Structure formats: structure tokens, C-alpha cells
Design an enzyme around this catalytic site. Structure first.
Site, mmCIF file in Angstrom:
data_model
loop_
_atom_site.group_PDB
_atom_site.id
_atom_site.type_symbol
_atom_site.label_atom_id
_atom_site.label_comp_id
_atom_site.label_asym_id
_atom_site.label_seq_id
_atom_site.Cartn_x
_atom_site.Cartn_y
_atom_site.Cartn_z
ATOM 1 N N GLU A 93 0.789 -1.192 0.000
ATOM 2 C CA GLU A 93 0.000 0.000 0.000
ATOM 3 C C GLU A 93 0.836 1.263 0.000
ATOM 4 O OE1 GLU A 93 -2.637 -1.531 3.114
ATOM 5 O OE2 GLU A 93 -3.975 0.093 2.413
ATOM 6 N N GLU A 102 -9.894 -5.412 2.855
ATOM 7 C CA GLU A 102 -9.810 -6.846 2.989
ATOM 8 C C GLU A 102 -11.131 -7.536 2.607
ATOM 9 O OE1 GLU A 102 -7.168 -6.899 6.695
ATOM 10 O OE2 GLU A 102 -6.931 -8.985 5.946
ATOM 11 N N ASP A 109 -21.098 -17.309 -8.463
ATOM 12 C CA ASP A 109 -22.548 -17.327 -8.765
ATOM 13 C C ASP A 109 -23.379 -17.966 -7.630
ATOM 14 O OD1 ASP A 109 -22.533 -20.227 -9.106
ATOM 15 O OD2 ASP A 109 -21.633 -19.890 -11.091
ATOM 16 N N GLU A 129 -3.104 -10.300 -4.793
ATOM 17 C CA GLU A 129 -2.578 -11.563 -4.287
ATOM 18 C C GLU A 129 -1.218 -11.290 -3.692
ATOM 19 O OE1 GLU A 129 -3.835 -14.247 -3.473
ATOM 20 O OE2 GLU A 129 -1.982 -15.355 -2.980
ATOM 21 N N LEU A 130 -1.071 -11.615 -2.396
ATOM 22 C CA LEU A 130 0.241 -11.571 -1.704
ATOM 23 C C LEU A 130 0.890 -12.904 -1.447
ATOM 24 C CD1 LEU A 130 -1.154 -9.242 0.813
ATOM 25 C CD2 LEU A 130 0.892 -8.564 -0.503
ATOM 26 N N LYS A 131 2.182 -12.969 -1.767
ATOM 27 C CA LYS A 131 3.017 -14.117 -1.465
ATOM 28 C C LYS A 131 4.085 -13.632 -0.521
ATOM 29 C CE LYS A 131 0.882 -17.031 -4.015
ATOM 30 N NZ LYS A 131 -0.498 -17.457 -3.606
HETATM 31 CA CA LIG Z 1 -1.698 -15.100 -0.348
#
Ligand SMILES: [Ca+2]
Ligand SMILES: [Ca+2]
Ligand SMILES: [Ca+2]
Ligand SMILES: [Cl-]
Ligand SMILES: [Cl-]
EC number: 3.1.11.3
Lengths: 226, 226, 226
Positions: A93, A102, A109, A129-131
DNA sequence: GCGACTAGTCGC
DNA sequence: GCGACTAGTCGC
């Protein structure tokens, strides 16, 4: 969907739920998730026979429906990913300059058969997406090779998450708190329509096959949630 | 073949032993067992060089003779199995039904090179493999697919137990208590003569080859029971 | 290439350094070591695209450089090797009738990019790789199968040790405390000039690429010692 | 066949 | 999110 409709189906309220807790886990039971979807699109090198890893996922989700549990999995590397996720987010961020909101879990559906759990929704409309790789070796792999060297499993995960949320692009950020410097790096992944077409074809089938398989043995999807 | 011959060779009393004693393990040392025989019958793609899995069981077994020490039980799968062992037994009794009497270990002949440790012997002359799979996934694979579903390794194991025991049929069972209902599934496997023949030629060679190796290093099968 | 060249870069007295201690590990960061060198000499089946393992080892070292840490690998095997270190050595000197001097670490040149950490240096001028294999199975493999049974990753390690230390021969030994007798086996591997060249063509290019990579991200080799 | 690479596979 | 195996592929 709504946090209301989810209640009817599962009795669970989703507004007061944390990535990881009891209710979060039950919400995912029997559901094709972005983290596991690499298995659904896995292909044999020859024939039309589902490879073992795709079968194993098939029987894994069926067990989830028929037992109403999932086995608890702890691994050092996963716990690390969890431990550093918050710091990755904040760093991300600060650097990208976007706000992240979050997100609980999102289903594609009304059927509720397909879902992702984003690491967040960003103020610019992209998902996140965080790694936090357990090995600094894998961080480095991504820091140098960028898009080129995202693992196919991770790609299917991101693409599926667009497929589910209908979004057009997604941040993919890798964080390593052991880096002296350069410990954050991210790219943007554009919605890819080869993937979209692949899911349109392959996912509905996989769901039909799971329906046929549960009928044979006298269960119905949704039992995990009674 | 009797408790007397076993006492004379190993100094052990078989009636004092349950599945899992320090004596149960000692009696298996250096002995080609059912659960491991798939390595014995592995063939190469072409030629006659033993495959890696076959060498690696070869050296495993030889090491047991010369150290007299046993492979590490995966404590996690066994603590699971031991915990529901009895419930599965009783459920399958009640079900099939038949009377299940315990079998510690059965050797094929006086040489004591070859044995099984069945999960029981049954009143109608069948043996019994009764497993509580650590994963419900595996329960499902079998529950849905029947036996075509399962192993290279399981078929070989079962036939081997018929080979050792001279018997004509075997119950192959799985029990999963996490299943909400119908968590016992089972099939009867009939003595397959093409397997019987495979053992008859392959297992003796294998045993000649271990005796060659032991003599090369001045050991003799049986030393592990001193 | 002397004891002091080290203190200038690292600030480390190589005297105090006992294989395993804090200082030992620091000295290995980002350095191509004999145990790993098999990854460096790997070549792809077809094109030019460095094989997984090679790339993987590539990224491992870079991360050693930028994190200044390396994580714990194995531990299991390593703690076993520690415990039997002295006995393997005593039995070896007894049996071979040479005396073993422990060497901490040995760099090939002042570039300091290349090192091994032999299990000893022998009174006959040979080095000593002295393993206590985690499984007796692997002991057995080497006991029966000798020179020819020891893998590609091991030959590479030994040859690199000669390449590093400019020596013409190396002892490759195994010890197994669990063996009743015959618990130690050893051979002598001679310098192999094709390996020497392979290390000569390949290693310096692999180092040149590490430097390109580190620049790319504003790191410099040397940095980890601070 | 041989044997080093390569691609799953599944446990933790 | 690895990581220890191993079944498979490909150029000699
Ligand atoms: Ca993750
Ligand atoms: Ca059993
Ligand atoms: Ca060493
Ligand atoms: Cl891990
Ligand atoms: Cl030199």
C-alpha cells in the site's frame, strides 16, 4: 450474491469472519477455490485421462462434502506466509499508493461451487494476491524474472480470481522481510481470456462430474453446511 | 510351520505378540513382507536390470539383517490407525458379516524369508486387509472407484498375502469414521494365478541375491534374531 | 590466498572456527560450495535454458547475498552426522592408518567465490569426505556397490574439492554406527581432469552471471559480510 | 539401456 | 509454500 444469501445456505454470517478462522474454513468446504484450481485445469500429456493430481483434488473435495471436515494442515512455510502477510500488505500500500480493503470470500454465482479469497480489493478496482515465500530463493526468482517466472499454479490462482470476481486486473506482490533491500516487488496481471475460456469449459465439467459421483453414493452438495 | 519353529529360530513366543510390539517388528526384520513386495516385482521398461525401487528395497532389507534395526513407523498415520482399529474391526464384523480373529505374522515356509501380517483372518476362510486411511480423500477414491481404483501396490500386497497363506480370497476394506454415513466400504479379491506365478519365479531369485550380498560382507540371514 | 585475506573482507579469525559454529556459516554465504556444485555443472537436455536445479541454485546463492542468511536445510541428516563425526573419524584413522586434520573451509582463490569444507585433510596428502548416511540402506548401497554406486552429486562434490584445494586424490567414506560389523567403507577417488575443465569452462561463467544479476538489483557480492 | 534432467505428487 | 520422492522423457 450477498452476505444475506450466504447465510441461507450455510447459516454462517460472513461480515464477521477472518481469513483463517473456523467459519472461513467451513465456507470453503467442497468449493473450487483459486488456491487449488491449478489441479482442475491440469492436463495429461496424452489422452483425456485426468492426471492423479486432478483426481486427488476431485476426491479431496468430495470428501469435504461427505465428511463436512477438512484435515488441518500446518507447515512451517505456510505459517510464515501467514505471519508476514499483514506486513506485506502495508508495505504494498505504501509503495503502490493504493488503499486495500480486505475481502472475506467471494463466490462466482448462486450455485456457490466456485470461489476465491482475495488478499484484498484495491481502491483502483484491481484485486490483490500476496506471497511471502518461505524460501528467499523463491523471492529472488520472482524479483528478477518478474512475470516470466510466476508459477503456473499462481497464475491459475490469479486468473481464476478474475474469472470469479469478473475483474480486469490483479496485483501480484511478493514480500521477504529477510531482504536487506528490495524486499517488495509486485506486477499487475491482466485478465487473460485463454484462461477464462479454459475455466468456462473445464470447471462446469468438473462440477458435473462431482455431482454424478456424489449421487452414486447417496450424497448431495451442500451437506457440508447442515 | 508353527510357534515352535519360530521360537527355535528367533527365541520369540508369537502368542505374546500384538500388531506393533517390539517383537512384531523384530520378527519382520530382513523378511520380504506383503506391504513391500511391489518393490520386489517391479520390472524394467526393457531388459532385466532391477529398477531403482527394487535395489532400494534390496538394500533396505539387507541393512535390517546387518544392523538388526527397523524402519521408522510414520507415527502420524499409525496413531490414527491404532485409534480406530477396533471400531473398524467391529463394524466390518457386524457388516459383512464374519468372525475376525487376529493374525500377528504368517510365514510362508520354514525358510522364514517371506511373510505377511494381515489385519485378521476371517471365519469363511478369507484374510482381511482393513485400513483406516489417514486421508478421507483416499477413502473416497476407493469408495467410488472400487478396486480398479486402487493400487499398483495394494493388489500386489493382497495377492502376496494369498501367496504366503495359500488362501483363495481376501477382503480389502477401508474405514473412515469422519464419513457422515457409509464410512465402511469393502471388496473381495480372488487369488490371481498370474501373480502367484510371478512370486514363484521372482521372489526366490531375490532371496538368492540377498544371500550372495550377505556372504560378500560375511553376514548370514538370521543373524538379526541373535 | 592466506588466512588474513579473509579478515579484511569478513572480519573473521579463521582460527576459532569449528565446523557448525556461527562463524562457519557466515563464511559460506553466496559462495559456491562442493555439496551444491552439481547444480552448477548441470546442462539442459536440448537448448540453452539452464535446468531447474541450476536456476534454483543460482537463486539460492543470490538470496544468501541479499539476505545475509541461509535457512536450515535437512537438519535431520546433519544432526546425525554431527553425533557420529568423531567415531567415524576414529574408526577411519584406525582402519586406514592415516592421520586426519580437520579443515574449517577452503577457498580456491582470493576471488573467494568458490570453497569446500572437507571432513578432513589426511597425513597422506589426500582430502577426506566422511559421510554418516542417514539410512543404513544408503550405507549398504555404497558397501556392496563401491565407487560405481556413489551418485553424480557425490562425485561432483569430491572432484570440486580437488579443484578447490589443488589435490590429486580424495577419500570417500561412509560410517554406520548401527551396523554390527563392517560399519565403515571407503574408496580413493583420483583427480579427474575432465571435471577440472568442466569446472574451468562452467564455473567462471556462472559467477559472471551472479554479478550481472546482483547489479540488476543494486546488490554487490561481498555485501553479506558486514 | 543408461542416466541426467523434468514434471508431477502429496505430505507437512 | 515448500521439499523429498519418484515416475517419465530424451540424447546419446
Ligand atoms: Ca496469499
Ligand atoms: Ca495393515
Ligand atoms: Ca562435508
Ligand atoms: Cl516447509
Ligand atoms: Cl586456480
Amino acid at each position: 450474491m450477498t452476505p444475506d444469501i450466504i447465510l441461507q445456505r450455510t447459516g454462517i454470517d460472513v461480515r464477521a469472519v477472518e481469513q483463517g478462522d473456523d467459519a472461513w474454513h467451513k465456507l470453503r468446504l467442497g468449493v473450487i477455490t483459486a488456491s487449488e484450481v491449478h489441479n482442475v485445469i491440469a492436463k495429461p500429456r496424452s489422452g483425456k485421462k485426468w492426471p492423479d493430481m486432478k483426481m486427488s483434488y476431485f476426491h479431496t473435495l468430495l470428501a469435504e462434502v461427505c465428511t463436512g471436515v477438512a484435515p488441518e494442515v500446518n507447515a512451517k512455510a505456510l505459517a510464515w506466509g501467514k505471519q508476514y502477510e499483514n506486513d506485506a500488505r502495508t508495505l504494498f500500500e505504501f509503495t503502490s499508493g493504493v488503499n486495500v480493503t480486505e475481502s472475506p470470500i467471494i463466490y462466482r454465482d448462486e450455485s456457490m461451487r466456485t470461489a476465491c479469497s482475495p488478499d484484498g480489493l484495491c481502491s483502483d478496482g484491481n484485486g490483490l494476491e500476496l506471497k511471502c515465500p518461505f524460501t528467499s530463493r523463491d523471492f529472488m526468482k520472482f524479483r528478477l524474472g518478474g512475470f516470466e517466472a510466476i508459477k503456473s499454479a499462481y497464475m491459475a490462482q490469479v486468473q481464476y480470481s478474475m474469472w470469479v470476481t469478473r475483474k480486469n486486473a490483479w496485483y501480484f506482490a511478493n514480500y521477504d522481510p529477510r531482504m536487506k533491500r528490495e524486499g517488495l516487488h509486485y506486477v499487475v496481471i491482466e485478465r487473460d481470456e485463454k484462461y477464462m475460456a479454459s475455466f468456462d469449459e473445464i470447471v462446469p465439467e468438473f462440477i458435473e462430474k462431482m455431482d454424478e459421483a456424489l449421487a452414486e453414493i447417496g450424497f448431495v452438495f451442500g451437506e457440508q453446511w447442515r
